Scaffold this active site. Sequence first.
Site, short mmCIF file in Angstrom:
data_model
loop_
_atom_site.label_atom_id
_atom_site.label_comp_id
_atom_site.label_asym_id
_atom_site.label_seq_id
_atom_site.Cartn_x
_atom_site.Cartn_y
_atom_site.Cartn_z
N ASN A 63 33.43 41.99 60.70
CA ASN A 63 33.62 42.04 62.15
C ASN A 63 34.92 42.76 62.59
O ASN A 63 35.03 43.20 63.73
CB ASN A 63 33.68 40.59 62.69
CG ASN A 63 32.41 39.77 62.41
OD1 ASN A 63 31.44 39.86 63.15
ND2 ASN A 63 32.44 38.93 61.38
N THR A 114 52.97 33.29 45.23
CA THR A 114 52.77 34.74 45.36
C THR A 114 54.09 35.49 45.30
O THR A 114 54.17 36.57 44.67
CB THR A 114 51.97 35.09 46.63
OG1 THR A 114 50.69 34.44 46.57
CG2 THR A 114 51.71 36.58 46.72
N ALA A 115 55.12 34.95 45.93
CA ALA A 115 56.44 35.56 45.91
C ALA A 115 56.99 35.67 44.48
O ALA A 115 57.61 36.67 44.10
CB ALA A 115 57.41 34.76 46.78
N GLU A 121 46.47 45.88 52.98
CA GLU A 121 45.22 45.37 53.55
C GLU A 121 45.61 44.40 54.61
O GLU A 121 46.34 43.44 54.33
CB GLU A 121 44.38 44.65 52.49
CG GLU A 121 43.05 44.12 52.97
CD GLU A 121 42.38 43.21 51.94
OE1 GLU A 121 42.68 43.28 50.76
OE2 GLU A 121 41.43 42.26 52.38
N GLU A 167 44.82 41.52 45.07
CA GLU A 167 45.14 40.11 45.20
C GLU A 167 45.12 39.39 43.85
O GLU A 167 44.33 38.44 43.63
CB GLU A 167 44.27 39.44 46.28
CG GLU A 167 44.82 39.67 47.69
CD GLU A 167 43.81 39.47 48.82
OE1 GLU A 167 42.78 38.83 48.61
OE2 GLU A 167 44.08 39.99 49.93
N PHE A 176 31.25 36.03 42.66
CA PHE A 176 31.33 37.52 42.47
C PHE A 176 30.99 37.93 41.04
O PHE A 176 31.59 37.41 40.09
CB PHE A 176 32.72 38.08 42.85
CG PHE A 176 32.80 38.59 44.27
CD1 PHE A 176 32.17 39.79 44.62
CD2 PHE A 176 33.49 37.88 45.25
CE1 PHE A 176 32.24 40.28 45.93
CE2 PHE A 176 33.56 38.36 46.56
CZ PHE A 176 32.94 39.56 46.90
N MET A 213 55.15 35.77 41.73
CA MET A 213 54.35 36.77 41.05
C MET A 213 54.84 38.15 41.43
O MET A 213 55.05 39.02 40.55
CB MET A 213 52.88 36.62 41.41
CG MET A 213 52.00 37.69 40.77
SD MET A 213 50.24 37.41 40.93
CE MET A 213 50.07 35.96 39.87
C1 LIG Z 1 41.13 41.16 51.50
C2 LIG Z 1 40.08 41.50 50.42
O1 LIG Z 1 40.58 42.51 49.55
C3 LIG Z 1 38.76 41.90 51.05
O2 LIG Z 1 37.74 42.29 50.11
C4 LIG Z 1 38.25 40.72 51.88
O3 LIG Z 1 36.98 41.12 52.48
C5 LIG Z 1 39.25 40.38 53.00
C6 LIG Z 1 38.76 39.26 53.90
O4 LIG Z 1 38.88 38.04 53.57
O5 LIG Z 1 38.22 39.57 54.97
C7 LIG Z 1 40.63 40.07 52.42
N1 LIG Z 1 40.68 38.78 51.68
C8 LIG Z 1 41.87 37.98 52.04
C9 LIG Z 1 41.84 36.56 51.43
C10 LIG Z 1 43.01 35.75 51.99
C11 LIG Z 1 42.73 34.25 51.92
C12 LIG Z 1 43.95 33.39 52.26
C13 LIG Z 1 43.69 31.95 51.80
C14 LIG Z 1 44.83 30.97 52.10
C15 LIG Z 1 44.55 29.57 51.53
N2 LIG Z 1 45.76 28.80 51.25
N3 LIG Z 1 46.51 28.53 52.09
N4 LIG Z 1 47.27 28.25 52.93
#
Ligand SMILES: *[C@@H]1[C@H](O)[C@@H](O)[C@H](O)[C@@H](C(=O)O)[C@H]1NCCCCCCCCN=[N+]=[N-]
Lengths: 74, 384
Positions: free
Chosen positions: B231, B116-117, B184, B66, B1, B119
């Site tokens: 999708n 994450t928790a 989200e 995130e 990115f 954080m």
């Molecule tokens: C949220 C994001 O803001 C969007 O831009 C993305 O398009 C969307 C997506 O993936 O479709 C979404 N991203 C979420 C990413 C979550 C990934 C979880 C990974 C877990 C790995 N470890 N373990 N267990």
Amino acid sequence: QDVVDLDFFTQEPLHLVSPSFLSVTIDANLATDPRFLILLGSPKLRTLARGLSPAYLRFGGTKTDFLIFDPKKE
Amino acid sequence: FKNSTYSRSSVDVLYTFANCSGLDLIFGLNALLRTADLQWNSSNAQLLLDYCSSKGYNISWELGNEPNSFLKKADIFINGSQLGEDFIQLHKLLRKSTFKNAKLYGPDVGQPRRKTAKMLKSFLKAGGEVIDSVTWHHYYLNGRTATREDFLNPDVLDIFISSVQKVFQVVESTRPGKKVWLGETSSAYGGGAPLLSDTFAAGFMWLDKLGLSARMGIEVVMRQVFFGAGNYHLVDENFDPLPDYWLSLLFKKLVGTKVLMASVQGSKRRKLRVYLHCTNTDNPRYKEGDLTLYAINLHNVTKYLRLPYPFSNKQVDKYLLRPLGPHGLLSKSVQLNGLTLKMVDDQTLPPLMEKPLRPGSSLGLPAFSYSFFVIRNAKVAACI
Ligand SMILES: *[C@@H]1[C@H](O)[C@@H](O)[C@H](O)[C@@H](C(=O)O)[C@H]1NCCCCCCCCN=[N+]=[N-]
Ligand SMILES: *[C@@H]1O[C@H](CO[C@@H]2O[C@@H](C)[C@@H](O)[C@@H](O)[C@@H]2O)[C@@H](O)[C@H](O)[C@H]1NC(C)=O
Ligand SMILES: *[C@@H]1O[C@H](CO)[C@@H](O)[C@H](O)[C@H]1NC(C)=O
Ligand SMILES: *[C@@H]1O[C@H](CO)[C@@H](O)[C@H](O)[C@H]1NC(C)=O
């Protein structure tokens, strides 16, 4: 046997959700599409959008943290 | 990115779309603009805030998406404490702007894994005073590997319950009573599961997520996405509505803001899933006191639901959703009580027509289907 009895709790509301409870996003990456203006200008898309009112529209995504506002750009 | 720029024009398109559609825009700000000592550099945000002020735009804000995965995404680590301070600085900027009462939401963390928790908890300690709602994200599956069986599996559906409980544990320990939003969410991450996330089968997850979120205390759920490349869109690239759009519309027309509870008698609560709210009062057909039940049948046979006293003899309206063939649960077309749902034209949504049932009849729910049922003249005082 495929008959099932339901129990209902109706004494009081357990929670109150927002009228906008069912809300939606548009991924921030859609702003990198050359056709962004045409897409969000679509009367058909606006009609579908209106159907879900009231709702929040969250503009955000992974790309949120790779977007810079430029007041000069065309 | 990579970094990318966007114009005043892009902002106007976005705001206009929201404003003309009756939606409330929430705009996510770039949190990876850091200073020398890794504070948030707010100057770009200032430029945007100035522009929106001048145009008189009513907008709510977030900062970052995130942040738990910033190390992965940008090789920068921002801890929750710092992030909270960054929100404090945004809040000061908003308070000095022409919309000084604008809402601020965050931190848009992922689901509550240990890191994450942590954080989230440190963020709420630091910054939790200035946010109007705590936002977090949830996905059931990886779109690359998700199967059709996964979409129909009650054990997959059930995982959401533990995530919700963990988030509320963090929140109750730091900012008790603060509202909690899913900022989200979708069936599957990575843009969704091809040929599953855009079909009738996607509805089992979405309707259950809605039910559980409402039942467990989540105030707002934000569906990834209304329209887009993924999708999991509600509306495809041709601006045509997919089955989840129709489900979402029906949900909105029938389901009220007051959340109640339903449950099925017996040791098997897995495959027949039931939710109960007061009926949406803005619906012209229904009256104060009516109830809206919704139910998901993940069994491979029809189930017949019996309503408890004192609702067993009431007039009930059915709103049963089933796929249009030949592709079954993988269909992108849906029927309501046997009528295909389709736009009347580009400006006109169709009517959503009920099927009145014989008073006193059990509620039929075919295999692999979902339905709403409005109990008319229920006279529930909690709803009135
Ligand atoms: C949220 C994001 O803001 C969007 O831009 C993305 O398009 C969307 C997506 O993936 O479709 C979404 N991203 C979420 C990413 C979550 C990934 C979880 C990974 C877990 C790995 N470890 N373990 N267990
Ligand atoms: C149908 O599902 C079965 C397991 O579900 C149970 O039995 C069916 C007949 C229903 O009564 C349901 O309510 C029960 O929970 C499987 O054992 C069976 O293989 C499935 N049949 C198929 C796939 O044809
Ligand atoms: C913030 O960003 C601007 C533009 O990128 C830069 O010129 C400015 O010096 C930065 N401020 C700090 C304190 O680093
Ligand atoms: C979090 O990061 C900041 C900024 O880099 C640092 O100064 C601070 O010590 C860290 N906090 C904790 C609790 O580790």
